[PDB]
Design a protein around this ligand. Structure first.
Ligand SMILES: O=c1[nH]c(=O)c2nn[nH]c2[nH]1
Ligand SMILES: O=c1[nH]c(=O)c2nn[nH]c2[nH]1
Ligand SMILES: O=c1[nH]c(=O)c2nn[nH]c2[nH]1
Ligand SMILES: O=c1[nH]c(=O)c2nn[nH]c2[nH]1
Ligand code: NA
Ligand code: NA
Ligand code: NA
Ligand code: NA
Lengths: 295, 295, 295, 295
């Protein structure tokens, strides 16, 4: 037998960081969950009990906090690139660092219509994430994303004209509910290393903002022919607004809301145009995926 | 043996309802999870296999949808009272109906600075809940609450002067992080029945708004001596602003953020005044409770 | 305003303990999650920022580990009683200690048909729990339970003869699936203090074993007329086998499995006697409760 | 813009199936959660609102139940292959079917030392899974796995000799706790189609059994030099016992149990040889991965 692939490190490292402006008293907080997995000349730790090649996961944990202490933790694309670069530069035998960061929301509170200098609220479990793969001799590959953005529209969603055969029971509809949890990923052009990442720092926050804004506006305004058609429109627009992105990926569940026929009860009408009460379905759910690139 | 207590029904009933304004095109959505448990002369279903006394849980489920179809689902205090009242009035042998409602957030989207007529976003897993106990001959007892309101302040929290003995290792602090998940309950004066509940309908939304506003403002502005002291201030203010409430209950975890001593590493200073990077602790957590009433 | 009730302490304290037999090499592990909440003359911590009355939750945490170090952690009824007793005896102003313990399963592995001296497997998320309320001048009240015991029977469950009216759509059935997650609680006679608890130590493990054995055997062998009827039989038997228990409580969801009519597809028969494929329903679910005592 | 990749279908389809022996009265149950995602000439559903190319996800759901009705659902490798094959053979424009199956445990109960004909218990959340990719012109690729197998050993785990530098604080140890959640995957030689899968049916259950048995025995008996070294031994043995497997993948968290120094309290000794009480750490955790193939 032989090791064909191997990576190891520390997962689920919770990190908080605060910035305090000594002049204004305004404080700003950041919270994330970090995973760092390393690859390199480490096969003998698996095959020969040779731990000398292992950078202990406990040490990787320490390194995550130390790096957050000495560097900005925002935008996460930059932090992840600095962290990953550290491992491949520090250890000669480590050749790739895989950094995943989940950013948690801490939005400044408004109290009496004025932003508070040091109080925050978790407004939704929506996350901003990055996957930063730092590979020696192959630069830095970054995938940025937003996830857990849960939305619903109560009309202006349709689904008709689909294939009908002996397995089909679904009725065509010209007016249905559409609800999903948005998982959207934009994949950046390869970067040659940390300097190139630094040269584009402002584009990371800007592109995340565009992705979110396009997602929400398209969802709200598209009289949707299907999840497929709507998600494609989102991807197209994001690609047109940031030329440094190569592809856009969407992963969308169709979280179904079923009509409830109540005509068995005193002839109550609750279907079609009379539909007011629906049953949200926890499972199963449609799952619709696509990766969109440049023609 | 004998039945000392018994209640049964349907839990986890997901319900959506939409309101459509035919004139303006504006739609409004409501989503909840409902539990209804009944008590009454039902002991023989347990002791003698006598199912004739059982209103099937499947039927309770149907009744929840039918009631949502024929009545407003807001405020949840009203809906729960109508639902509970139905069971005790409809079935002679049913003497209590216990209705729990969890309201899910569907906040209208703003697109290009203008509210959208039929698109919504789940802004946080914060819930608005009610527990409505409808008991024949004993009126309606309502407990309203907000839960899952997750907040953090990065300073203006203290904890010193606590008891110190041979079990104590915690250092006193004059500046720490405070984060919690707010669970706040206001208990209403007993109502004699559904008419009395109806007579106070506007106070339900108003009191929920006050509870939330007081929670947030007190959390942000109190230079906290402890969780205990801060939560008490919240309770006091809510009681002073709604005389129909008898008590206010708070349940607050202290979700700890620990300093990370990094001086072992190149003498890095990250404690006390130099503290920037912290380790959020998933567990354990302090848990602080109190019920506040009128003197 | 005034404090009407208050309790505080530390929740979610994970604890592991190992016992090593120096003679045989056999090791035995215990793992639990502990919550300790205290009551007493502590109202001024809430109303006057008087932290001198507070035993810090961090100290309660330390005390949990120290007590596990100096005392057996099994049976959990005993450990919880020792822990709770400590707080009310150690602190004059603390008058009640509320101890909740969740015991996690670590079952010894069998390797090549022989029990292994120090390797364990988590065989199910089924828990064994206790709630031990130690109240000064009122002894020790213990509620023991098993929870998360998930079971299914594929026949010998029925439900017919229930009430039918204009809200009823459920068909009567003489053969259905029954699945539930068992939550069973036995409430012990009040104990005057720790000595009395100690005098009954062997009965705690024995009664837990009986409760589980009765639950499983009754579930498997009862041709069930309803959840209500079956759970009552379980409670009766447990009460008859341990006279130190006063009441038995069951909390059982009916986790529904629905038939799937496939006759629309090539006349496939999958209902009634031909039912082979079913759709498990995640929600909603029936919820059936009862507390059984002695006549 | 252009579609670079696309797949869609139904996720989280819960399925139960029962087998009844008319002669013996013995019944056997199977429960799973199924996902089916399709690829093919479907890009116009995304780019041109052309739903004619869409096999509705609702129809995919129906097809999953119909296929379970007409075919054995065990072993899951076979069921997934039959299901995936159906879609690519039935629809000319569908060229790949991706089938994921999670099998849930329903182990027959033993009552009074005798196996019960129709009562089952969920003994752990451990799952048996398959990923079956059916691609037209490229056969069937199957990955089988076990997951959520949670284990602990209280000694005979070591970790010393790892790299030590300015980022290192971890002490070397010659006796520690090792606990993990086993995720083990065996990847089968490509199969040319469903007939070839059928020709190996008995090997699927046998290889799952071997994987589990090897996992448990190696975990229990290896005086472990590291997670890396131990997992490699498992992979090697599985590969040596089934020549139709090409690679074995392990994904193992190191779920840390920390010593608790209590010497600050009355000089209590709870470290090293005196270590009895430990603090399980929920996060962070080491994460160790490797894919092992044939040399
Ligand atoms: O938008 C939709 N896309 C689909 O592919 C589908 N299938 N069923 N319902 C659906 N809705
Ligand atoms: O606010 C706090 N209250 C407490 O009771 C406590 N105990 N430890 N830390 C604490 N912080
Ligand atoms: O056992 C049952 N009890 C009930 O009360 C019930 N209601 N619907 N189905 C049911 N099954
Ligand atoms: O088995 C282990 N492997 C590792 O790579 C490691 N790092 N810290 N502790 C560890 N334990
Ligand atoms: Na390197
Ligand atoms: Na009545
Ligand atoms: Na006392
Ligand atoms: Na095809």
């Amino acid at each position: 037998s032989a090791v064909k692939a191997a990576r190891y490190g520390k997962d689920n490292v919770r990190v908080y960081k605060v910035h305090k402006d000594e002049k204004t008293g305004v404080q700003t907080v950041y919270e994330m969950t970090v995973c760092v997995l390393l690859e390199g000349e480490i096969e003998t730790s698996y095959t020969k009990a040779d731990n000398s090649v292992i950078v202990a996961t406990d040490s990787i944990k320490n390194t995550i906090y130390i790096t957050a202490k000495q560097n900005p933790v925002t935008p996460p694309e930059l932090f992840g690139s600095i962290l990953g670069t550290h491992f491949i530069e520090k250890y000669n035998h480590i050749h790739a660092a895989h950094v995943n960061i989940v950013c948690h929301r801490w939005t400044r509170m408004d109290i009496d219509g004025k932003p508070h200098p040091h109080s925050f609220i978790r407004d939704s479990e929506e996350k901003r994430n990055v996957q930063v793969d730092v590979v020696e001799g192959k630069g830095i590959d970054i995938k940025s994303s937003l996830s857990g953005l849960t939305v619903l529209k109560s009309t202006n969603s349709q689904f008709w004209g689909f294939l009908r055969d002996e397995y089909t029971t679904l009725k065509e509809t010209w007016d249905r509910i559409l609800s999903t949890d948005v998982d959207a990923t934009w994949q950046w052009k390869n970067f040659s290393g940390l300097q190139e990442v630094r040269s584009h720092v402002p584009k990371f926050d800007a592109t995340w903002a565009t992705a979110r804004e396009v997602t929400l506006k398209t969802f709200a305004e598209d009289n949707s022919a299907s999840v497929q058609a709507t998600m494609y429109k989102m991807a197209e627009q994001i690609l047109a607004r940031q030329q440094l992105i190569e592809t856009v990926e969407y992963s969308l569940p169709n979280k179904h809301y079923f009509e409830i026929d109540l005509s068995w009860h005193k002839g109550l009408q609750n279907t079609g145009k009379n539909a007011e009460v629906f049953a949200p379905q926890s499972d199963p759910n449609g799952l619709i995926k696509c990766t969109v690139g440049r023609s």
